[PDB]
Amino acid sequence: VVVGDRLVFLEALEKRVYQATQVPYPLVGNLDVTFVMPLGVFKPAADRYARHAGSFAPTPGLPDPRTHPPRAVHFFNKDGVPCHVTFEHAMGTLCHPSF
Amino acid sequence: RHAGSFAPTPGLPDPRTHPPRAVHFFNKDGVPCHVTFEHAMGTLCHPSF
Amino acid sequence: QMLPQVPAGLARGQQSVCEFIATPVSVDLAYFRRACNPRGRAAGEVHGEE
Amino acid sequence: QMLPQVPAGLARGQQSVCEFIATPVSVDLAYFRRACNPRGRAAGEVHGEE
Amino acid sequence: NTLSYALMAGYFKMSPVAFTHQLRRQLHPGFALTVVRQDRFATENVLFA
Numbered sequence: 001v002v003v004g005d006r007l008v009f010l011e012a013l014e015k016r017v018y019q020a021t022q023v024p025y026p027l028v029g030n031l032d033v034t035f036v037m038p039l040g041v042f043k044p045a046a047d048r049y050a051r052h053a054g055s056f057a058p059t060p061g062l063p064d065p066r067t068h069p070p071r072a073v074h075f076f077n078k079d080g081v082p083c084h085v086t087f088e089h090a091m092g093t094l095c096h097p098s099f
Numbered sequence: 100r101h102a103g104s105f106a107p108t109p110g111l112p113d114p115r116t117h118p119p120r121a122v123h124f125f126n127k128d129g130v131p132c133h134v135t136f137e138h139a140m141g142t143l144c145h146p147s148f
Numbered sequence: 149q150m151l152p153q154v155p156a157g158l159a160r161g162q163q164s165v166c167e168f169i170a171t172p173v174s175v176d177l178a179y180f181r182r183a184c185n186p187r188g189r190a191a192g193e194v195h196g197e198e
Numbered sequence: 199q200m201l202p203q204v205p206a207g208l209a210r211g212q213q214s215v216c217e218f219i220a221t222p223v224s225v226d227l228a229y230f231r232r233a234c235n236p237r238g239r240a241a242g243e244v245h246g247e248e
Numbered sequence: 249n250t251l252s253y254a255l256m257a258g259y260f261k262m263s264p265v266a267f268t269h270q271l272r273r274q275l276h277p278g279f280a281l282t283v284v285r286q287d288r289f290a291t292e293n294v295l296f297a
Contacts, residue, residue, distance in 0.1 A: 027292065027293045027295065028290055028291070028293075029291040029292075029293050030288050030290060030291070031289040031290075031291050032286065032287070032288055032289075033286075033287055034285070035284070035285050035286075035287065036282055037180070037282070038175075038177065038180045038281075038283075039280060039281035039283055040279065040280050040281060041173060041177055041180075041280045042280070044174070045108075045111070046114050048107070049105050049106060049107060049108075050103070050105065051105070052104075053103020053104070053106055054103075064109075067108050067109075069276055071276045073283070077160075078160055079160065085283060087271045087276075088271055088272060089166075091267070091268070091272070093168040094168070094170075094264065094267050095264040095267050095268055096264060097264075099263075099264060126210075127210055127211065128210065130178075131178050134216065138216070142217075142218040143218070164286065165285065165286075166283050166284065166285045167284045167285070168281045168282075168283065169284070170279055170281065171279070171280045171281065171282050173279065173280040174280075175280060180282075186282050195209070196206045196207060196208065197206050
């Protein structure tokens with residue numbers, strides 16, 4: 001196959017070799033990333049604002065549960081199912097003689 | 100531009116009407132980076148004033 | 149002596165491990181919106197000497 | 199002489215320097231929206247010779 | 249009125265035995281944690297020589 005101005009081979013080695021043997025193929029790499037997320041930070045008084053007048057209105061006759069300082073997070077799993085993280089799980093760190 | 104475009108935390112005065120004392124802008128790679136009066140000390144606090 | 153119980157059945161890929169780092173509540177949120185360092189000082193090595 | 203020091207940072211390219219000029223607060227904000235001159239008077243060019 | 253509750257809530261101990269009840273009983277101590285975690289992704293490379 002010709003690419004650019006060069007004339008290079010093009011091979012797949014899954015059928016001629018590696019086929020029907022218990023050794024994995026060595027081009028299936030393994031990328032690595034590291035995620036971080038803040039848990040319970042609290043923003044100052046200036047940047048606490050509704051983007052619209054019609055907010056996430058709570059039930060009429062109750063105090064809004066939104067302005068309260070948050071204590072949990074939310075994200076997505078591999079498949080996509082929601083899965084949350086709360087201070088409760090941090091018990092394995094802040095409850096130990098190491099503290 | 101609109102009635103309730105923004106809204107403070109209800110039960111608190113909005114800090115939006117106050118005269119501003121800082122400016123925000125973007126950096127070389129888009130990370131926010133502000134500058135305000137506090138930096139201008141090296142210019143407004145000197146005998147050359 | 150000492151061995152985490154082997155689970156019965158896995159639903160998805162191998163399970164990750166999460167840690168926890170104390171940090172003052174008043175840290176600037178935007179420090180986390182872009183790529184950041186969990187330390188707080190972004191030293192590393194590539195940009196900066198000993 | 200007066201050098202600050204040799205930092206270990208080198209964050210993102212060399213870092214510029216910002217200045218500060220006094221100005222009456224009642225200055226027309228519209229003067230900064232388009233291109234302008236910080237001195238207020240656009241002199242210097244073949245605009246005016248005398 | 250609310251300053252009273254603020255001052256009172258700012259009177260809980262800080263020790264694993266106190267965190268034991270605090271964290272579990274839905275109260276927010278004066279921290280802010282940073283969750284970290286590492287993942288791995290199988291990819292399809294294209295090597296040249």
